Write a protein that binds this DNA or RNA. Structure first.
Ligand SMILES: [Mg+2]
Ligand SMILES: [Mg+2]
Ligand SMILES: [Mg+2]
Ligand SMILES: [Mg+2]
Ligand SMILES: [Mg+2]
Ligand SMILES: [Mg+2]
Ligand SMILES: [Mg+2]
Ligand SMILES: [Mg+2]
Ligand SMILES: [Mg+2]
Ligand SMILES: [Mg+2]
Ligand SMILES: [Mg+2]
Ligand SMILES: [Mg+2]
Ligand SMILES: [Mg+2]
Ligand SMILES: [Mg+2]
Ligand SMILES: [Mg+2]
Ligand SMILES: [Mg+2]
Ligand SMILES: [Mg+2]
Ligand SMILES: [Mg+2]
Ligand SMILES: [Mg+2]
Ligand SMILES: [Mg+2]
Ligand SMILES: [Mg+2]
Ligand SMILES: [Mg+2]
Ligand SMILES: [Mg+2]
Ligand SMILES: [Mg+2]
Ligand SMILES: [Mg+2]
Ligand SMILES: [Mg+2]
Ligand SMILES: [Mg+2]
Ligand SMILES: [Mg+2]
Ligand SMILES: [Mg+2]
Ligand SMILES: [Mg+2]
Ligand SMILES: [Mg+2]
Ligand SMILES: [Mg+2]
Ligand SMILES: [Mg+2]
Ligand SMILES: [Mg+2]
Ligand SMILES: [Mg+2]
Ligand SMILES: [Mg+2]
Ligand SMILES: [Mg+2]
Ligand SMILES: [Mg+2]
Ligand SMILES: [Mg+2]
Ligand SMILES: [Mg+2]
Ligand SMILES: [Mg+2]
Ligand SMILES: [Mg+2]
Ligand SMILES: [Mg+2]
Ligand SMILES: [Mg+2]
Ligand SMILES: [Mg+2]
Ligand SMILES: [Mg+2]
Ligand SMILES: [Mg+2]
Ligand SMILES: [Mg+2]
Ligand SMILES: [Mg+2]
Ligand SMILES: [Mg+2]
Lengths: 111, 64
RNA sequence: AAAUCCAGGUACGGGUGAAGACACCCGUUAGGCGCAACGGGACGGAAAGACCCCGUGAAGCUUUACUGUAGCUUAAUAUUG
RNA sequence: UUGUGGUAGACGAGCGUUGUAUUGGAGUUGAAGUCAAAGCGUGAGCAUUGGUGGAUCCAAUACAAGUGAGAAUGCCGGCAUGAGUAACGCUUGGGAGUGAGAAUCUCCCAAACCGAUUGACUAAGGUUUCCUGGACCAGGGUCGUCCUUCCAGGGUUAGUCUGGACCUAAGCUGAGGCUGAAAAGCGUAGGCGAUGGACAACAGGUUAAUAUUCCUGUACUUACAGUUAGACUGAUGGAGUG
RNA sequence: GGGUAGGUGGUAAGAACCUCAGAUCCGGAGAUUUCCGAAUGGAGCAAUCCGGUAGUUGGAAACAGCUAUCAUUAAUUGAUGAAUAAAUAGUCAAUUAAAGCAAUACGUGGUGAAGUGAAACAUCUCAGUAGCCACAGGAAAAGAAAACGAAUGUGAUUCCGUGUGUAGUGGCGAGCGAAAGCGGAACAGGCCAAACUUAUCAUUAGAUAGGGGUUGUAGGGCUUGCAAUGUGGACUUGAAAACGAUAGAAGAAGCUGUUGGAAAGCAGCGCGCAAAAGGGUGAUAGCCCCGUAUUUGAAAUUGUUUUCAUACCUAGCGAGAUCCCUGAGUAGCUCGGAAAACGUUAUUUUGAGUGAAUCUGCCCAGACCAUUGGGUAAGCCUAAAUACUAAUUAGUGACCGAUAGCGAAACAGUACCGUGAGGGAAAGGUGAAAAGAACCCAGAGAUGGGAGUGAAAUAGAUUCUGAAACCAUAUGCCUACAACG
């Protein structure tokens, strides 16, 4: 399975942004990146191009979007625990459904 | 080729040594001669064989 | 663009010198820098002289040079009575 | 105390480069590289500081070498000199327009050369160089708004034209076969091979680009089937013509 | 089968979809596989043209779709059949194999130079090398003594060290150079012909198919007995098991502060280890991530080994007879060559000629003869050690780091040169992240100057660092009567 999936809450443990909590919107496995909403906001200088029916307007000024972040800098966020903390996960297989599930190693919380 | 039809023995390549031991490549050819070999009273083909094979056939009562 | 180019700020007369000097010795002359000309010199440029000699170098050709050989011709022997 | 010029040459002692092995040390508070400066050595050489640079490097003792560049009409790359010099490879003037910019682009009027040709149709070859619009990185021996250059789109219509589905010349290939150490060479029957022989379409119009091909008009030729009438049909071979 | 939550190959954003009834992706097994090319229906200027035959569907037929087949040679079989009665040659049909390529590498065989050295050159060397051709194989070749050789000797072949640069061989010059023995790697010996016998061929067999036999301190056959039912193979089919190969699963351990754009650096306090190999993460991370040590797992294909059964082969010691068999144009010999270290010679081989004997036999022990001794030619097959790497997996380097390393880090045998064979380059690095510079000014525009992002824009796509030659600008000094390495 994968350490980080599309949807789970995640934070950053290195860089200028420390303790930045967000939801992963998209994962590129090949480039080992991850788009997390609200984090790594870059503002491309949006030019103007008019060669299509939609390009006739293409209103784009200082649109701030999301820049991808290396998957190593991401860490899963705990929610079930009363005191939330950042830890590592296991890949135990519970015989109830025989499906692999991530479980933290500093607690006993699933996913 | 200049070779027997019963056997496959062909030419022998060697040196032509003379006085002063000068080397020149030469070829010995087999004594190919025409002969007719009967086989069960028929097919008297005019094969081209060497004299050695001809002698062998003669001493074998023309058997091949 | 081009061949050329060791670095140059690159006079003339007599002598000297590897034996014919822009550069050495002794004298004379000459403000700095161009442009248009013509070829005296720079033993000017292009071509590791084709002439000559050397190399126990190459190649082509010639002959009663040597050693061989294709081909031609003669004999023995086998096919062959 | 005696000495210390020196080529060929002999001998001895050292410097420097890269890497490896053992130790220690420096480095985003800035390593290597790289530039500058008014330093230290007997020599190869070695430091200090500052600028640039952005991640490796230094000292000691040993070991192993693709280990030291000024010359080889040395190889490669760059840049000078000659020199803004020679040259720019047969063809004029003006008016109007476009354009930011015009001797060079567009139109018009002349003018000058070709006119058994610089005119027109095609074979061979070339392979999109053809038409339209746009552009002026590069190419055009100048310029350029322009080009046979570049970009985007488009363009080649056949029963009768040129060649196959027809035929052979020189020649090539060539089952068998002959010859030859091997590879192969020769060669019969067959099969290819036009620059030749046989075979039915002419006139006009149309698009920016095709036209005996598309369109209009009028024709022709060869196959197959049905049908009518007449006739016995007569080749893979013989003969004539070709 | 594994494995998930993403995917629709790169220059590549966007548009439109697919995907949790399990996608994309990885592995095993299959399906489809246009045309040229051994090309093989015929041709031909390669990727084109022109067909025949037998089916089937439309048409009224020509015709047009959709299928299969159609080359040559060799072997076997059958049919037909000339000169010429029979019979062959030939013709036709059916079945089975062969064609070709590459691994710039190893093997065998045929053919086979020259540059060069000898300080010239012809013998010789180079060298049986290069090249040309034929045939393979996973290796090939060789191979079980008519042997070495001088002894109370060894007992197939192959490869390594020594013997030794020795004995020798050489215009005795340049040079060339073993065979014994010894020490090692591996080790394996089998099977036909003839005798004798069985059955069948107009049985003129001298031929076909079986039993018997495979030799040297001679063996086998002929006749007559004892002992044998085993051990082992280079061996066929099966069944079972084990070890692997082709995807994978799990896989421990860290926070705080400081410089900094950014920490992983530095410092403090800790923790894990059968994991301190490596890669990435904004600098230099054992504890951030992927991994590594270790434990594991295969539906399907495939490799090695072992066990059981099962085919095939595989068996000793005597006696008598005194009879038979033991590889012929063969061994020798002569005339020309060659192989061996030998420049031809005892041994090996052959183009021409000639030509033996049959265990009281034949060959050999460097001419040759005698004694002694060794061995059984003229028939075949043979694993292992040995030679090499185009390719697949893992890994290493006191090997290279864009003039180096393969010619080729990039789309290189490309661009380009030549009719052709053939010859043959150069060229890598923005930044952690394109956040690739919106906007304003000048300009026709590219572009430049600001602004903005960024730690840095003198990192700006001309994109790491940026040396010298070379070209310009400037502070200071000197230079227009001056003969200048
Ligand atoms: Mg010779
Ligand atoms: Mg004098
Ligand atoms: Mg000379
Ligand atoms: Mg001479
Ligand atoms: Mg000579
Ligand atoms: Mg004669
Ligand atoms: Mg001295
Ligand atoms: Mg060092
Ligand atoms: Mg520095
Ligand atoms: Mg060197
Ligand atoms: Mg020059
Ligand atoms: Mg100049
Ligand atoms: Mg001049
Ligand atoms: Mg002039
Ligand atoms: Mg002029
Ligand atoms: Mg002109
Ligand atoms: Mg003019
Ligand atoms: Mg005129
Ligand atoms: Mg004309
Ligand atoms: Mg073109
Ligand atoms: Mg045009
Ligand atoms: Mg235009
Ligand atoms: Mg121009
Ligand atoms: Mg028509
Ligand atoms: Mg024809
Ligand atoms: Mg013609
Ligand atoms: Mg036209
Ligand atoms: Mg599946
Ligand atoms: Mg010679
Ligand atoms: Mg010589
Ligand atoms: Mg010499
Ligand atoms: Mg073999
Ligand atoms: Mg895992
Ligand atoms: Mg882990
Ligand atoms: Mg690390
Ligand atoms: Mg003898
Ligand atoms: Mg020899
Ligand atoms: Mg005997
Ligand atoms: Mg003797
Ligand atoms: Mg014998
Ligand atoms: Mg290179
Ligand atoms: Mg370079
Ligand atoms: Mg070409
Ligand atoms: Mg700027
Ligand atoms: Mg530059
Ligand atoms: Mg730079
Ligand atoms: Mg003065
Ligand atoms: Mg004066
Ligand atoms: Mg003077
Ligand atoms: Mg002076």
């Amino acid at each position: 399975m994968q350490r980080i999936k599309k949807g789970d809450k995640v934070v950053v443990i290195t860089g200028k942004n420390k303790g930045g909590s967000g939801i992963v919107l998209k994962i590129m496995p090949a480039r080992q990146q991850a788009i997390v909403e609200g984090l790594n906001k870059v503002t491309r200088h949006k030019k103007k191009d008019q060669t299509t029916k939609r390009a006739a307007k293409q209103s784009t000024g200082k649109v701030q979007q999301e820049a991808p972040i290396f998957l190593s800098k991401l860490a899963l966020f705990d929610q079930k625990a009363k005191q939330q903390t950042i830890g590592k996960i296991k890949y135990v297989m519970d015989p109830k459904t025989n499906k692999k599930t991530r479980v933290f190693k500093k607690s006993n919380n699933t996913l | 080729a200049k070779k027997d039809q019963l056997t496959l023995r062909g030419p022998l390549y060697g040196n032509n040594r003379s006085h002063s031991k000068t080397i020149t490549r030469r070829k010995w050819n087999v004594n190919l001669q025409p002969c007719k070999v009967k086989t069960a009273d028929g097919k008297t083909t005019r094969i081209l064989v060497s004299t050695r094979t001809l002698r062998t056939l003669k001493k074998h009562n023309r058997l091949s």
